[PDB]
Amino acid sequence: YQVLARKWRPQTFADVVGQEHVLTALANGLSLGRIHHAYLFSGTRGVGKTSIARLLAKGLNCETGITATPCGVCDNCREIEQGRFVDLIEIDAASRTKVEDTRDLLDNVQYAPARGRFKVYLIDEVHMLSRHSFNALLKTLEEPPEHVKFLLATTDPQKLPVTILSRCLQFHLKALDVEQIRHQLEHILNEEHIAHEPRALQLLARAAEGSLRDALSLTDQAIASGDGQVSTQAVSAMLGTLDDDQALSLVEAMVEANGERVMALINEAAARGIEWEALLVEMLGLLHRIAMVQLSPAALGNDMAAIELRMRELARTIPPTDIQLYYQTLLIGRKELPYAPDRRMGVEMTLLRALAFHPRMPLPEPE
Amino acid sequence: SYQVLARKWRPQTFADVVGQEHVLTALANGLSLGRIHHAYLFSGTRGVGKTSIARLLAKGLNCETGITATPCGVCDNCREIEQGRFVDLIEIDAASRTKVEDTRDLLDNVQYAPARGRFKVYLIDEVHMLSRHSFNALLKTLEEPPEHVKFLLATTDPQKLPVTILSRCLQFHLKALDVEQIRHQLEHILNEEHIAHEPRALQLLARAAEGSLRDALSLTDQAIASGDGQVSTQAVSAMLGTLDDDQALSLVEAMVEANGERVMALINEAAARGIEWEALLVEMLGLLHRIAMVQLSPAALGNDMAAIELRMRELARTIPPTDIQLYYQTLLIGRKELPYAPDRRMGVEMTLLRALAFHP
Amino acid sequence: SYQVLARKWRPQTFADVVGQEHVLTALANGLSLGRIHHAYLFSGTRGVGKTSIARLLAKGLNCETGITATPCGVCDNCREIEQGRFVDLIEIDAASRTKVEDTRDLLDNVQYAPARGRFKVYLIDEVHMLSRHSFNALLKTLEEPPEHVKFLLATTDPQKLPVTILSRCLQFHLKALDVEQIRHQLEHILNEEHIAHEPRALQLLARAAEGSLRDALSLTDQAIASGDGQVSTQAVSAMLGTLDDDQALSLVEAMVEANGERVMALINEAAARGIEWEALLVEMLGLLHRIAMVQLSPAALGNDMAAIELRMRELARTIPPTDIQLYYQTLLIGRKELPYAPDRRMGVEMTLLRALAFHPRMPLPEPE
Amino acid sequence: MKFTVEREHLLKPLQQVSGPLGGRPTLPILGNLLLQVADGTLSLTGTDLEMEMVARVALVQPHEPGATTVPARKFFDICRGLPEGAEIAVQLEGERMLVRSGRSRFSLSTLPAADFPNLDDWQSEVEFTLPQATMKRLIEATQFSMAHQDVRYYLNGMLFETEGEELRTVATDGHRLAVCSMPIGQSLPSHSVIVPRKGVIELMRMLDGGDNPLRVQIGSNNIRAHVGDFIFTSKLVDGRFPDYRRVLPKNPDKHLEAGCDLLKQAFARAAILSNEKFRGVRLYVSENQLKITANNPEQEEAEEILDVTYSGAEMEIGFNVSYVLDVLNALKCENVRMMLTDSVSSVQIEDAASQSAAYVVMPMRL
């Protein structure tokens, strides 16, 4: 019943998917004993900044000692897992943004930790602190007490002062790869004994750009929609993204200058009950993929492999100039869609623009 | 006490809601299976059932007969929620509660157990109006809240919210209701209200609803007030300023054939009769789209315009498709800038003269 | 923990101070001749030794031996200063002490004689943040301080400070340590700690430090962490690649040389970094504008940036005005149409492709 | 470490040590009082860096020696909030302090005593006992003249000079100098030190008219006062107090002896009838006559005539009413003698009976 994101939070360094460089650096630092007093974590949403920070806190305060492989069973590990560890001070920058609040926070830094071996501080979205707060924090960051560790975190590291950046070891977490997201989703679903299909996992991974938290949220929503199962049809309906084959056929009809097929395809889409702007976006994405394939050969991911060969044909037959013309026509039509009398009418008129100005086979021009 | 149709016909069960089948199915399945999230964000256009669906979910969660997919609507808590009395259902306005103390007390009272129900639902409306510091402070609550509070978020546009908020919330995209759904709902409401209605009037009201059912109900109430308690086609047409005549086609023909004097005379007489200019532009856009369609496929023309068939066909035989696209583009540009023009008449005249400038 | 390099390798004597030769000589002459000014202002950038030099001056001015330019480093005062627990060494920050009450308390406490130090040195930091009231109070107390008190101001942006403070204070603005000094200091630190390293890794660390010894120390600590107790060229290069945020300049270079695969690789790296795509487009547009202005006038490239000075200069001198104009126009069009693109990533890729391998058909002013 | 006391014995010393210590501390540990139990005595020091108030209490329970620092505010609140008459047992476990009182237990976080600012081992330059009455008289005589807020930081306090078997206090604010001397009775080396305004205020606050001999220790830069089982240490304000010897006129031949009460009531009447600020009152003294007139060019001249016992040369001097009123208030007696040289000179005020205290003021030029 518990949310996937909360339930499947990492509890050991092995559980973390991706971010190999930061994990290796932290493990080596803990093992060799060359531990710095201020670590800054950066990246995008849901990449695992807080997860890695909490894993490091567990490693530092573990009963067995400072190690890169915390046991996960001693009292400190359990308390940190439950978020009820007294020494692990989870602070929010926005909660205390004024200089007075951060000074009050730093007033108690000197006191020894209650039971843990370090008084770890974990500040979330540290970039929200004011300039005065940063300057006040500089002195403690440079020379903190030997039993005090700072674990800053922020999605935007460019806002921090240069002094703060130089006073701490930076670790910029990278957006997780689509394959890594898909593998993690498959692993968690298999562990939870839930039926799933490869296409559904691919669609979910594509939907989650690089944030695994978004992937987990979308997976939970798909579980709800599909009544305990992750089916390709359910995920496609929830995402509102029709199958790539229909958009590919639409663009093939558009380039061939045969409007009858275009009309039939849009009628079928209307019967299916799919928002028209999504169809236009899919057509634009297909055109962009064709243009990229023309630019470079390896421009299509394995997810589109099922339709790669066909796509390549469109790259060879269709010149680049008319590809750009079609892309621009579709983009301007999407620009005009909100002000059109109807979404169907807007898409139909955009397709008629594309056909009328078709370079190879222009629509007949009666006087 | 008398209430407007929007308040009278607010859905009270998961079956009374029209459209949005996917989100309703997901919510019902989650409630049945017990896999309930702690953050439900609803994104969509106005008048699609944000507040209605949120209140239905709150009733389902807080029902005294356990967590039920379809709340009965008769319990003490169910009735209080229906009447907006339930203390555990805190309805917060984001725009009003933007100050620091508001959010600070919002995240400080979470620890207190619910007064009456089993969940202390927080229904935050138009969440995109909250300040950035508010989102930053509420991230922790939205991530790992206690197991007695559920956050229900409603926003017209979700992209404006911080990416972290979207990450920590389950997003439900309420699809804009189509014309058929709006027409069916209006027909059902009028039949249950013992009010006579014509199919043409219902179609016109659904078309003018622009995908929002609350707007459809407001237009129906306006027609009722103006239509002496009768939803008549003539009354709705007068209220909505719909030409539904050959004036639009004649003006389009004049525009295509230059002849600025005819266009000016048509606009002058239309202004004298006092019509809606946005309706005129929409009618012209529809006619141009139909001309393009018949140029592509002659079979795509209906019989409603039979009286004006041949003349329309003449355009399909006389205007090249590129010119049709140019005229449609100019009309859309006029549509976009019509609200911002010094006057509606000035905007329409500028659009029509710009279209007149175009010619083979 | 084995301490950290920045903390361990604080310069505890004037002899072991890297760079800042002019400031060091001036301070040594002042201490030897016995002429000490009322207030000192150490300015410059971060990680150059402003705080370190201020603490060196404080410990040499209150040393048990006397006012000497070569503090012993073993007496009670020197050891206490090094440990950072000397009572008379009053280190304060303008951040949380701009309040009227706090400034008044500091002014009142100034009059009291030092506890066990020859001088009661006040090491104020970030003086440019002092409010107008606090600034005026500081000026008034600096107008005629007691003979037993001293002020060692350490700012980072003297332009904010009005020259009134300089009217009663002696400034010793530091300069960037330059690559060679930073590399030599890193080599000495690593050798003294029995740490294996390669010369190219040290060169990369020094060049990446950007004229800041503290940044170099942090970077080499990161290299040790990722290098597993040994700095190597591959480890430092990988760390820099992960930490590099100059994707806009590299993309501009690739577009200039029409290297499509390089553009794709850089876009993939930026996606891994997860930077805002509109922000990336704006940064590239600004870089193109700066290149155009540098071509117009060499002085247009301000000294505020120096890591990409050579790249900017070579790009400006190489490409002609027309090509940079076309790149700027294409990037502007791409930025404008980005909201309606199928995806932000796709929009960026499309505009990059258009700029590097296409050209827009310009309009024609048809005769009237 | 371990000891046991009664909250009745700790309510007063805790209040005393925690009194001056207020507001935020410059250093976090300065916000904490250092309590140490040793040789049957518990000493609590509420250090303020600039000032240190130490209160000592007697221990009869089987304590254990030890020292530690603890925040003053919460410890005082804990001691005060317990039931009246309840005994408090304090112990140290790990880095925390446990407080037991009957059925109640509390735990407090304690910083190490090493980080506490140590009281340096400076040896007092001049140590001597003194009764409270003499010190209180000196403070009362030489506290109204010190400048409350002056650019010259050394004039904010007042200068104590010990010479031979004599202790002298001199205070001034740029216009008047009040000097009061008292024979100590024990020969001591010559030494001068300036005590700040806050230090003397705290010292006079400590005075309570008791029989405990007040022991004063003057150091290089610190002054310490022992009263019974209480210690007050302050840091002497630096600088150099101007020598008072040059200020004292040599031969103020002109003399004026008059009833102190008469002058007091005359000045009070002038002040109440001349409440307008500025415009120092002008007094014309003549043979058996003293006419005080308001200098206010706008307000009506509230001239007041008194029959003083003066029979010398007549002259008009533009004094400040508030200054003379305060000076005469500082000298509470029945008769007062003022000695001056000429129109432009420093008139010295003294008691017609006693001459230990001198009040060399100067006229306000008109």
Added chain:
Amino acid sequence: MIRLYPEQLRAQLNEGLRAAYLLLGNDPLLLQESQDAVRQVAAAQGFEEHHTFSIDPNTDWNAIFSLCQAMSLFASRQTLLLLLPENGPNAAINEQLLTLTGLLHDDLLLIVRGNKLSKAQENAAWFTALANRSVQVTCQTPEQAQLPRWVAARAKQLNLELDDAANQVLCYCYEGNLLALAQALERLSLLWPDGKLTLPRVEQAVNDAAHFTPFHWVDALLMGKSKRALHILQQLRLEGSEPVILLRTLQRELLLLVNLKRQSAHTPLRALFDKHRVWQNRRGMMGEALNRLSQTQLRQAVQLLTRTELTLKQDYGQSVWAELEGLSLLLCHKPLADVFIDG
């Protein structure tokens, strides 16, 4: 009523002190050194009191009156300094000053420091009363043209040797910051006792710490020196000055230039200048600006300025400085196709 300069003030003090002194100007170093010289001469004469007060409505005056009407217990012939407010005296301050002049005493040495008074503020009752015994030392900061001679004289007084290159470097680095210039001269003298300061000597121990005003930037653009305009823009950016005031100051002169250029087709320049009542010293500068650029310019400049304002107060970005320096280069004799700047 003697108007003097700080350079020759030492002789005036030596020949005899005056009852009233007042330092008027904007140069900080000149004011500070004049004040120090006057105070030292007073101390040598036998004045031990150096009371200082800041004029402000919040501040009281009873202490000032008491100290001016009273001597010192252990000194005599006090000296009082008054720090005028930056904006200038107001009616209440005028009343206070004339009151002070009313009861002013010879033993008191009056010194006044503050921004130079205006023509309207120049005339006053207290000023006229003090004119009988008033010596006013002009303390304005020398112009860029006057800077090289001033620094050369300063170096010669310090027994140093400066060449043309070193003088130019010092002027460039400390333009309008003569206090920092003198401090740098002292530092260089200490570093090299020989006294010969060649170009490497000065350049290896100097920093860019000049201070400017938006009027200086507009003047630089009018002259057309790109390096100076870029340098002043950099200094203003580092000082944190907001671009709104720079944009307004530029806009005023741009509109004036556009009007002059458009209306100069058939109208004499002299009549237009007389009608506009512009500064006499700026007549030649305006003529040079007008004849340096034709109507082809002053059109993309206005459009660029409007675009800058829109992108400033609508997009709220941080690239305003880039647009400002682009416009700066445009106003100079530069091609500036304007495609980059979107003029």
